Amino acid sequence: TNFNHILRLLNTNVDGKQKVVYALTQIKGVGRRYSNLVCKKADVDLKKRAGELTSEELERLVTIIQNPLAYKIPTWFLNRQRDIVDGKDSQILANGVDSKLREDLERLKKIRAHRGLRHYWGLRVRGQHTKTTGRRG
Amino acid sequence: KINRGLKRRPLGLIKKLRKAKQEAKPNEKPELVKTHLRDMIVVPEMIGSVIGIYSGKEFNQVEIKPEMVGHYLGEFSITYKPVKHGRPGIGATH
Amino acid sequence: PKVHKIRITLTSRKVQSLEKVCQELIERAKNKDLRVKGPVRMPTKTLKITTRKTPCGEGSKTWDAYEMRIHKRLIDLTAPTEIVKQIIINIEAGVEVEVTIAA
Amino acid sequence: DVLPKEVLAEVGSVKLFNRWSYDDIEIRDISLTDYIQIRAPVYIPHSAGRYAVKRFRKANCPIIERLTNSLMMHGRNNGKKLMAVRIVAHAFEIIHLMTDQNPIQVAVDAIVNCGPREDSTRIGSAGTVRRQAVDVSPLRRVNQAIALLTTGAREAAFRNVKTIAECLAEELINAAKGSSNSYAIKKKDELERVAKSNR
Amino acid sequence: GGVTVRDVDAHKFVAAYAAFLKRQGKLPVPGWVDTVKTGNAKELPPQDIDWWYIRAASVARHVYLRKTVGVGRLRKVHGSAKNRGTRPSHHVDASGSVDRKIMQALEKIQVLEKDEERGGRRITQQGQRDLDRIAQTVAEAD
Amino acid sequence: ESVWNSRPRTYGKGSRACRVCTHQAGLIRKYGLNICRQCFREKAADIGFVKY
Amino acid sequence: AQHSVILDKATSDKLYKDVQSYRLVTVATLVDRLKINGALARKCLKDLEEKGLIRQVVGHSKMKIYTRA
Amino acid sequence: GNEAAFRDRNAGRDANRGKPTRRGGFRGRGKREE
RNA sequence: UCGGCUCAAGCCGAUGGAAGUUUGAGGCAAUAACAGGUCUGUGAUGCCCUUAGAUGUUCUGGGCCGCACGCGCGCUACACUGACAGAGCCAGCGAGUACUCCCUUGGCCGAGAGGCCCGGGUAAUCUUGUUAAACUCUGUCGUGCUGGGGAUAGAGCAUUGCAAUUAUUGCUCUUCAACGAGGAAUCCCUAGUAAGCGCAAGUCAUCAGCUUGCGUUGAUUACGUCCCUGCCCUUUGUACACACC
Ligand SMILES: [Zn+2]
């Protein structure tokens, strides 16, 4: 009886009685289809639940996540570039999104750019009509 | 933007910046230039000057920092004052 | 006297005027004992334009639809070269005609 | 071999919808004949009739089409009787498999029992009810029964893992006798009771 | 009696032909697989792992039943609607490179040929005979 | 000195106008008319256009 | 509000006890009466079919219905 | 100007939300000179 | 044509017939009014006003979109009569390039958006059989605001255009808000009609959640009345006639 209906990867619990590919979707920064690509390339039985697995396959699953480009995945499929003038690629995950979210705010804040002011005040940044739209909340 | 050709107006303003940088004496900040155009991307080559960009009513001068290479000069002078608001009028009764 | 198997086309806004022109042309040709392939009639194309009637905008909103219709009714023939000039005479007003030798 | 080989037995038999012959229909009561028409049968209800053109042209129609039309409502189900005809035929198999009796017997006897005989009409009393508990015509009986029947099935199956086919199936078999677990009969019985009050 | 491709159930033919073609096992795979979106309107890759081979039967069959076919026309045949969010939906066509390269490979294995006469590609005699054999087998098995 | 109206004007609205009004609003482009929708129905019978 | 995705011994012997006595069997009835998940119901459906204890009436992409043998 | 606006911490979205917000004898048209 | 009402004009019902509501739908449309709307359509037009520090024309930048909040026309959803993945596969109305750059097939490069090279059509000839959407068959998911839902934002890649910041739009990856059929009130509609679903044209270099037209699927209920809300005709009252403003 290896039914462990709880898992713990990278500081957040995930369920186990659901399917394997959809369980990784719970993690912030990865979606339903991005999960499919990497979970397909790790050669895992997609037809079974996320509870009946074991440690060794999990190890390759998580390993792909940190270094994607080394394991034959294209660059345009990724979601990070130009962290500085001479930048590299990346694949941000659960708590890096909040960390890099914050960073952007004081960058734009200190530069004193218009987008920062909208973010500072908290209005819509992308241009859209507001005089009657979503002002209640 | 840079793949397409650049017309008289970009070259004109760049030679003004060049003249300011050469005649500037070290241990001083270069002189101020006022302009109306607001569609130039920021270039790392364009560092070390002070530009008064027109905000639709007045010229606003800002010191340029290096790490803002990927924006425009227009994005740094707002057009409208923020709305503090007031007291509701004789409307909003029906 | 080498034939070229010509084709002649007509254009007009009217219908009854053009149509009687087509019959008389076929019989004027046929009287001198010439072979003729009959009146291939092209489809009629209808084009419309809809606009608002009011010039300002108050009151209910009402439209009107003007129309115009066009007919083609082209003709073909097997004949020598310059008999066409004698025969295509005595046409109506407004009616346009273009000749295609189709050599 | 123009026609499918498997479906061949029917030819030597009176016309029917493959699985069920309309022969030997119920003998239970009267006053709804001349208004339920089965004497001219049909295979599938997908007949593009012009019943609407006159008053009682829609009275001469096999009941099977009526059920299929009534089932499609509420925006999403507009004009898509293919699902409706699918469900009705399939639901017939369920009740046939759940009970040895003919499914047409199940539908007919249910609808003849779930119709009211007296109702109440709102004549002006200046805010009050001068409700004289008037009578009802046999034609309106089937009209209201079918409409309210189909609504009972959809509301029950709504937001449930059960599906309409067996939900509709269960609705008919409960209405056969006074089960009181059927949407139709519960609301049906109260109608005369409030009508009987103002009698 | 004699039969042809038009005398068999549609979805049966594609499944029957898919099984036979994979057992032969000769067609290129440009590696595009596992990274394709099936079209600009779709969201997730197909479920079946062997979907790519199955597809082969469908496209081969229609070129037999049409006077001429080209790469661009498959785009607009294979397309469908896209949920753009809260706006109304439209019609958008499928991916072009995917359909292009798959039929490139297909014709390299002697099933159809180029038609510089007028354009497009038509099936070749040997390819036509091949489909009939698989269709014929289905009839008796029924 | 002759750079006052230099800016190109061959692109979008304002580069075309009605033959009678030079009124750039609601202008018709079907079939190559280039006339206001308003002035239209006053010369429509002459152009040849009959309602039904 | 959860249905056990896996089949346990207690459900198994209850299953092979009554399913030869039901009049009709469906996906709904299994998830309702036996407190089992829908996914396992389709899996159970196909496995009990091949062992030959229930008979198929119609098969379709939406609903499967079976009766006694 | 723009830089000053960032420092001009006077009234914000939260500040706006915090801030709180005859018989005529003439007939149907008789009212006024309208 | 018939069968029952009936002085008659007619109404209804059956048969025949492609068609028996005026066969279906539109266009035009009397005498007479309104201080109805338009001077921002007009080189239609009176008077007044401005005219060289111009209210004439022209170039640069902005704004009409700025937002605590009340109201109107619409779009997407609240899921199993569903969502998701494969495959089968059917329209109609229209539009299209000369001094300009339109509709675009085919071949080649490109994950995708896009790019390059021959070519056809000024058109029942080419685009186009516009292989549209809905729909149908086989599977995955399974009552949980979950794979229903797509607001808000970050990063990157292109296209239109002189110019995209207050993001034009598209494409790529991530982020996953409210919303369980909606109170007092209130609308539209009688048969290929309501409703669902898409397509073409108008504005247009790009942008449709808009309007004008086109087709696909296709119903419940009635053949009525003056109870409510409007309108007209008669009888009636008047010290009004610029006529209850
Ligand atoms: Zn004009």
* Small-molecule components bound: zinc ion
Largest sheet of chain F: none
Global outline of chain F = elongated
- The strand count of chain E comes to 4
Order of helices and strands of chain E: HHHEEHEEH
Largest interface: C-F, 12 and 13 residues
Multimeric state of these chains? part of a larger assembly
What is the approximate shape of chain E?
globular
Instruction: Please state the CA-atom Rg of chain E, rounded to the nearest Å.
Output: 17 Å
Please provide the ordered H/E string of secondary-structure elements of chain F. HE
Organism (chain E): Chaetomium thermophilum (strain DSM 1495 / CBS 144.50 / IMI 039719)
GO cellular component, one term (chain E): cytosolic small ribosomal subunit
Pfam families (chain E): Ribosomal_S19e
GO biological process, one term (chain E): translation
Model description:
Chain B: One of its GO terms (molecular function) is structural constituent of ribosome. Chain B: This is 40S ribosomal protein s15-like protein. The structure is cut from a larger assembly and holds eight protein chains of eight kinds. Chain D is an all-alpha fold and 199 residues long. Chain D is 43% helix and 2% strand. A two-stranded antiparallel ribbon of chain D has the order 1-2. In chain D, helix 1 packs across helix 4, helix 2 packs across helix 5 and helix 4 packs across helix 5. The longest helix of chain F is centred in the last third of the chain and has 11 residues. The radius of gyration of chain F is 15 Å and the shape is elongated. In chain F, 6% of the residues are buried. Chain G has 69 residues and is an alpha+beta fold. The chains are: A mainly alpha (137), B alpha+beta (94), C alpha+beta (103), D mainly alpha (199), E mainly alpha (142), F mainly alpha (52), G alpha+beta (69), H mainly alpha (34). Bound molecules: zinc ion. Chain E binds one RNA strand of 245 nucleotides through helix 1, helix 2, helix 3 and helix 4.
Short descriptors:
part of a larger assembly, 8 chains, D: 199 residues, mainly alpha, two-stranded antiparallel sheet, 6 helices, 43% helix, 2% strand, globular, H: 34 residues, 35% helix, 0% strand, elongated, binds zinc ion, RNA-binding, ribonucleoprotein (chain C), 40S ribosomal protein S20-like protein (chain C), ribosomal protein (chain C), Ribosomal_uS10_CS (chain C)
Write the layout of secondary structure elements.
This is part of a larger assembly, with eight protein chains of eight kinds.
Chain D: H1 63-71, H2 81-98, H3 103-113, E1 118-119, E2 134-135, H4 138-157, H5 164-175, H6 183-198
Antiparallel strand pairs in D: 1-2
Chain F: H1 37-47, E1 50-51
Chain H: H1 2-7, H2 13-18
The complex binds zinc ion.
Zinc ion is lined by residues 18, 20-21, 23, 36, 39 of chain F.
The structure holds one RNA strand of 245 nucleotides.
PDB class: ribosome
Keywords: thermophilic eukaryotic ribosome, 80S, rRNA modifications, nascent chain, ribosome
Entry title: Thermophilic eukaryotic 80S ribosome at pe/E (TI)-POST state
